[PDB]
Symmetry: C2
Subunit: 384 residues, 2 copies
Amino acid sequence: PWTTFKVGLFSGAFVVLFITVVIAAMFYGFGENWRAGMRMFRAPFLIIECLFLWGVNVYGWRSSGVNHVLIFELDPRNHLSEQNIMEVASVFGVIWACCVLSYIFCDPLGIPQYAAPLCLYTLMAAFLLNPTKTFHHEARFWAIRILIRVIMAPFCFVNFADFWLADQLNSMVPAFLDIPFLICFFGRSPTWHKAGKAASHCVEYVSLLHPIVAIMPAYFRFAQCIRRYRDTKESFPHLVNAAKYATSFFVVIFAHKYHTTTDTYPLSKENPWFYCWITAAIFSSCYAYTWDIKMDWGLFDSKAGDNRFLREEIVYSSTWFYYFGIIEDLILRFSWTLSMSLIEAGYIEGDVMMTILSPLEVFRRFIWNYFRLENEHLNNVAKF
Amino acid sequence: PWTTFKVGLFSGAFVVLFITVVIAAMFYGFGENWRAGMRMFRAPFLIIECLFLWGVNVYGWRSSGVNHVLIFELDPRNHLSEQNIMEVASVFGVIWACCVLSYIFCDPLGIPQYAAPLCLYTLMAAFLLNPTKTFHHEARFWAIRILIRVIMAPFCFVNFADFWLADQLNSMVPAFLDIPFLICFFGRSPTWHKAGKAASHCVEYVSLLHPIVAIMPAYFRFAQCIRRYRDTKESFPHLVNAAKYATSFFVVIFAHKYHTTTDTYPLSKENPWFYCWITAAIFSSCYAYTWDIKMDWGLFDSKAGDNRFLREEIVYSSTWFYYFGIIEDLILRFSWTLSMSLIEAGYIEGDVMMTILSPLEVFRRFIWNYFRLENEHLNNVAKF
């Protein structure tokens, strides 16, 4: 009731403020180092999005006949509920938009230019890592403990939570890429002072590490799979899924060299490292496509379910949903192969295209969380 | 559920957009004739406010043990519900803010300057006077039929609905004052073209009629009272309440002459018409104060109810509410006597102070609708 009403006030405020952000950025300008800005304000946006989308997902799991409780291993007693999570996420969104606007309008307010993002990160960290027993305490400590288990992927036992959150983290890549930039930028120059034109020296470290961070959310994944294979003597599913993440680290590392090889790369076509890159990509894309549509979601049924191409039993009433889902995953998982063309083509360049793309990836992970949980529910009711 | 969620999206959008309006008006400017703008966009704002406040009021009547159904004479079957009304009002608010923003930013969009308000009024009129049988049809036709009965105040029989809505209209004065301006401005110059500097000739008709429109919402009131006295031979309540509205037309007409008398009025103090004006005002204010606090709301009890100064029985749990209410009505009903000082003092001038004040008046009518319905409920349960 009151919570729902809150969630809608903050949603509307988020939408209007995010429009006013984009307007402000297009016309008034994003500051002296727009690039720095974008890199600072990527990660909080995608975390918030991930929040809000898990809240909508929770709602959906409740509305459908899915045992959210069982599969997550959460005490029946405490469940963040799909209004609470959506409240939190919206509140956080309004706070992000406000800090962004402080950002753009630093000089009129008199506030220093880098105070707003670093405030944002302060408030977030305070919320997440709150040692008190106040509201939502059990949720946070569970989230922390699962993230822990994630980050210690090889040695810790794999649960379904570890499943979910490690895949989530592999979706939300750009935070991992941004963290090195934030380190650099705050080691080189402090806030309460602006730029210094050294802020154009962190980017010039071209992310020699980029690949490590880029792969590290897939790495945790990989090591989870190795773990699982160690534990269960069965080798097919987990080894396949491993071999796909191997291909994912391949594509990423090849990649760098395309970009890297500014010598004898004049002509794209030249320097067959790129063509190998391309090819590794399409390979990895179609691999990961096939894997998730066949086992993740169990679609394309041997069991010759009447409903078309799908399993005999569908928790969700609507069948266009799965048809939506298939298309969506197709398009968006292809997005990276599809994505380079613009940069290559002299169209919008650099980081920015990864900014634009990243929310779409998180949304498709959203959808994939729908279908994975559906397929886990329906397996676990099959078994009993 | 979905409605509630909507109501909160549009509420948040309304708040953010109304902030962006005020910013835009302060810095970017409100157009060539700001005065014309203000006069056009007063009335829709106060209608919307009145909508949204009756919706919150409905909510409150439901939450409390008040028979909203009975006293209004509405079929048990159809009741706009405190989410529907609040939806409509919010939707309308977002549309107002958008038209206002089109207004301010006419030249960048290329749209003509006066198209947005006249669109606004089109959409409103289409909604209210919709001859179809689509959603909320019964509500609108009831609203129309009660407004009818209002406007034909002497000859039609008085109900409690006629009560409520006629008092409401006496609150929402500035729409009555604005309608003549809109007539003038659209008789003199049409839209799809801007100003012409004749737009500064309607204001120069200084509202020679102003007093008629100003009094006409109190007039309908007055004639209702006469009606009631005609019907019920009892003469005390209705004659008193009449005599107060008489004083209200006195204050209004005196007033004009203060303003009017630009000759031998240099020195305020001079031209004892003003001092008479003042005095009529304080008189009318304290009259109308006393009337509403003693009979409207039944406070100050002979019946020596323990709860302080109030009746023995209070539907609302909270007693600070009534203590809030008393103060509120005091302050805000005094507002007009209190209000001239600024204009007189060379501080913010003219129409604008009536813009600022008017939402506060509507909010206090809101509160008074609380207490009147409470007092009617508690009388009607007393009787049976």
